[PDB]
From a paper:
The major tail protein of JBD30 consists of a central β-sandwich (residues 8–41, 62–73, 184–256), peripheral α-helix (residues 77–83), decoration domain (residues 88–175), and a long hinge loop (residues 42–62). The inner tail tube diameter, 40 Å, is defined by the β-barrel formed by 24 β-strands, to which each major tail protein contributes four β-strands. The interior of the tube is smooth and round in cross-section. The surface is negatively charged to enable the swift passage of the DNA. The disc-to-disc contacts are mediated by the hinge loops, each of which is inserted between loops formed by residues 217–227 of two major tail proteins from an adjacent hexamer. The JBD30 tail contains a long density inside the tail tube, which was absent in the tail tube reconstructed from empty particles.
Bacteriophage Casadabanvirus JBD30, from the order Caudoviricetes, is a temperate phage that infects the bacterium Pseudomonas aeruginosa. The virion of bacteriophage JBD30 is composed of an icosahedral capsid, long flexible non-contractile tail, and a baseplate. Using its baseplate, JBD30 attaches to Pseudomonas aeruginosa via the bacterial type IV pilus, whose subsequent retraction brings the phage to the bacterial cell surface.
Numbering used by the authors:
A (entry chain A), B (entry chain A), C (entry chain A), D (entry chain A), E (entry chain A), F (entry chain A): 5 to 256
Write the structure that this text describes.
């Protein structure tokens, strides 16, 4: 009869009212549910106390806050209103680098994970440049190339860079509509020897992430906090005891 | 003449004005009662001080806050505006699992506490699948089945799952009207050798739980805080010394 | 010429302007007096500074806050707008207990401090039930009886309970009008070898207790905080040096 | 050129514009002066920045906060808008005590510092009561007498109390008009070997004490905080370099 | 490329637009510059996101906060809107003391730093009073004289005091117009081996000191905080790269 | 699947929509991104709960906060709305110092980094003054010269100062329009063995620095906090999965 819960959360997106495929939202550090009710009050005046005598509720709302520490692209799509874009690995053969380059300039490439970088000189007789005259910062992860030097007989300035780029996953900002996801919290209550508890929320509309600290200070893992409103599902039976907002199952 | 109280709280629901059956609300960590009064003031002006000279009360209200650590279904019905639903244990024989299943898929079952799980293959000659090809996560408490593999001669994809499910208790969200409960606080005052004290509140209208942290951090047991207004009971005698809001009994 | 005061407070209720009988308010932990004044200001404009040049007071008010740790019925009547009700000890002979009782049911009695409990069986030949078949929780202080068992030949269900109940004192909620009490603070100033100090407040109108924690956590004694306004007494002489709000007497 | 000041404050009341007699305000723990100015701003718009270009002051005010720990009657008159009343020591011969007195009653006398208390019995033959039948609580400082017992042949109930009372000083609440006092702060700056500093405020209008804790907790001496506005004196020369609000003198 | 600055501040008053003589503002503990900008925003509505698409600034303001610990008269004139008054040392010959003086009275003199105090008796034959009959409190720094006694043949009450007073510097309250000062912050950046940095603010309008604690508690030197607005100078070239608010010079 | 990021930030100014040259913003201590959304809600009323049933977003905005500790002129131009001015080293030959100079006066020169200072006397026969009669405070970094003395035969007062000044870089206050910069955050996630992460923000409009403490206390390096709004870029494809606000690339 005491609660200290630890467990997992499964989310299923709702598209045009058809149930989606459940997925694990990965690690979650905090889950909170808050209930709000509006009440209209009636006061009697026969006792001289002008005090409250009755009240009936008019409003009913529920909010859910979730703190997730996973920065996976699947979760980014759900939290950033984005849609995942997958780019397959490939090669570049005739990319043209900026002109008027001199020692000290930093060239930014269009793709990441560059490898086997080659820069052919522009001339009737192609002459690949010596690798010792350029360096790859951040082991080519950021696609940045630094010029270390140039031969005394200055070669033709425009260059032709060819290389290989690895596959990547990208998420756009505000590129998807407001997601609607059904939530299933499967938890273990340690206070009762690890008893099972299940919480079902049929329809939830989420709110974008509020803050995202890209450069963190301290020993705390970056956290992503999402707020959402539990909407009223109109498909479930009205008279059923399961309600229309959410339900809790405890085995006993 | 000093107070440090520890005790129990009994609640009796009020339905259409007829007293209900008292029940223990289980463990309670904090109880507070607050009184609010509105006053209209009259100021004299013959002394030149334009100061207050009289005041009479117009409003009278009382609020009660209770912090309970019990997550029992009976308390969930009272705090979540829900009504308890009891499901008896039973069996399933012809549940159909999703199609196009492959290794790695997770199948969610409609009932919890699954045991003796059997998945018959779809064919003119029934052939139950080998148990080694599937696993039960969370010992079947959450009703989740993981596929470990499939025979090289891929069997018919649609499946027929049969198993046994245990009884459960469920609580809906906002599925019951605003409860009205009479409260009896029976406490022991340790400052006076454990003297008995009784507090009676005739009519209280409760407010849903504000927050419920499903995943808790630290060493603090999950707490459920409920606020309520003590309404004016119109059935008790008006001139009686017991009043109409509440009373306190101290043996002495 | 320094103040660190410890002392007692005596209160005399004011009914229709006739002085009441002084009583000690028991232990008090904190007393504070605050003065509020409203001022209307006049600004000159001949120097170019448009600054304040005069001010005269229009309003005058005084508030008093008292923290008392005594939960005595006399103080409850003063703080809860209640009136004390005394119930003398007595006996009950033919109280009828609820029907359809079975093992595990808890019966609540109308009076507290039950002793010599007897439950006669309903039949043409009265047959008191064996005491071993019932138990008294909380040594009968709360008037709760638990059924331990029933004879195999189930006796007549309706019962007739007779017992003895002790005297008690009760306080109603908001059952009395706004008290008006004159206050006398008799204190000792330790900074001057324990010099005597007296503070007189002629007329004070109190405000109900704000909070009352029935179940306390920690090592702090329950506190009852009361606010009040010091009204203007119209009976004292206007020109007298004693004023009409309050006075302080210091022997020296 | 550094300031850490400790010193004394002298106050001279202003009555109808005639200087009063300076007195020492006793111990003071904190003194603060705050300046407030109102400004009207003009913004140019030829540069496209729509930014501030000029400002001139319209308002000018100064406030002073003083924390004094002396509860002397002279300071009480200044802080409570009161006027001191001196009562000379004397005697009482025929004071009548309340009737229907019994053992346990507490009699409150009109004067403090009672000594040589005598209670003559009401009868044709006066018979002073035995001292052993009554006691003086708080060594008669509060003027409280407790009855210890009565002779079996109950004497005449009405009594005639005679005793001696000492002189006292009293202060009324809001019994004097808004004081106007000129302030002289004579301080020593320790940062410069104890250099002398003088601060003169010509006209100050004070604000009643905000809080006065009669029963104190901890090891902190009771403090009395007073706020005041420094008014504009119209008697000093307008063109003089000494101004009209206040001045500072530093010897050097 | 890191900043931890320590340095000096030079201030030059601006009178009718003509540059004043720079002076050192003495010790300064903190300097802060804040920039405020107002922006008007334009939102597009063709994407359905009703989000921000453009913004242009309309307002531009800059504020400066300085904390100085010097209480020198030159700084007092700048912070208190005062003008310094210098009084040369001199002598007094025929000052008349208050009449009706008795033992215990304290006489306040018009000048400070009194020395060689002489009080001639009023009579046809002048008779200076014995020095042993009077004392000088605070070694005459505050100009206070205490009477120790009087001869049995009471001399003529009115007195004639003559003495010597030292020179002093005084500052009036709100006796000068709103100063306008150009500021030059010459600082050393320790993070770069003590590199030089210069900050120029052409026109600043200051705000009076907010608080001045004459009697300080703790081990903290009294601080004087001044706020000011950096106005737009209309004399500098509009197209120049030095701007019109302020500039920073870093040698490198 | 966990984030603790450390990395670099590259900024490219946007002028009339043409991409600028990327530069490193130097050391950065904190980066935060916040998302704001406005929603319009629809409530049904057929269930009697008058609760939320639908919501659609109308507003979309994103803000970015960056804390940079570099006080380089390039960053000053970006944060102060300034434009860098470079002054080359040079010489001065006929600068005229203020007249009526005496011992103790401090002369401020128009340029910094003074060296080989010479002050020729005004006379028909030029006579350079002896160096021992003047001193250079702050080793001439601030361009301040102090007079140590003058010959008994007072030379001609007006002077002619010649010296050498070093090159400098200056930044004006509010001398440039609102910058628009594209941001590229290249970070390493230590939680995954140092995995690469890239964050692209296409269009950001910055807000001036709020505070700049020129004189710092403690052991904390001076910080420069800048806020900005991520605007909607209208050049990128509308249907592309990269969106129009920003994107995140994670290699995997």
């Amino acid at each position: 009869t005491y609660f200290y819960g630890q467990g997992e959360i499964d989310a299923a997106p709702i598209v045009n009212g058809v149930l989606g495929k459940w997925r694990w939202i990965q690690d979650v550090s905090a889950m909170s549910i808050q209930l709000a009710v509006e009440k209209v009050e009636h006061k009697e005046s026969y006792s001289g106390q002008k005090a409250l005598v009755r009240s009936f509720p008019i409003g009913k709302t529920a909010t859910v806050n979730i703190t997730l520490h996973s920065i996976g692209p699947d979760n980014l799509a759900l939290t950033l209103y984005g849609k995942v874009v997958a780019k397959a690995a490939g090669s570049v053969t005739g990319e043209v680098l900026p002109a008027d380059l001199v020692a000290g300039d930093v060239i930014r490439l269009a793709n990441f994970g560059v490898s086997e970088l080659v820069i052919t000189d522009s001339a009737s007789s192609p002459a690949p440049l010596d690798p010792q005259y350029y360096a790859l910062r951040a082991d080519g992860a950021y696609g940045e190339v630094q010029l270390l030097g140039l031969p005394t007989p200055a070669p033709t300035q425009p260059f032709k860079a060819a290389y290989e780029y690895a596959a990547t996953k990208q998420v756009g900002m505000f590129t998807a509509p407001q997601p609607t996801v059904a939530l299933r919290y499967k938890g273990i209550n340690l206070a009762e020897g690890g008893a099972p508890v299940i919480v079902e929320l049929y329809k939830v509309a989420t709110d974008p992430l509020q803050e995202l600290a890209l450069i963190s200070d301290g020993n705390t893992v970056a956290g992503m906090q999402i707020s959402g409103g539990i909407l009223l599902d109109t498909s479930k039976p009205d008279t059923g005891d399961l309600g229309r907002f959410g339900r809790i199952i405890q085995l006993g």
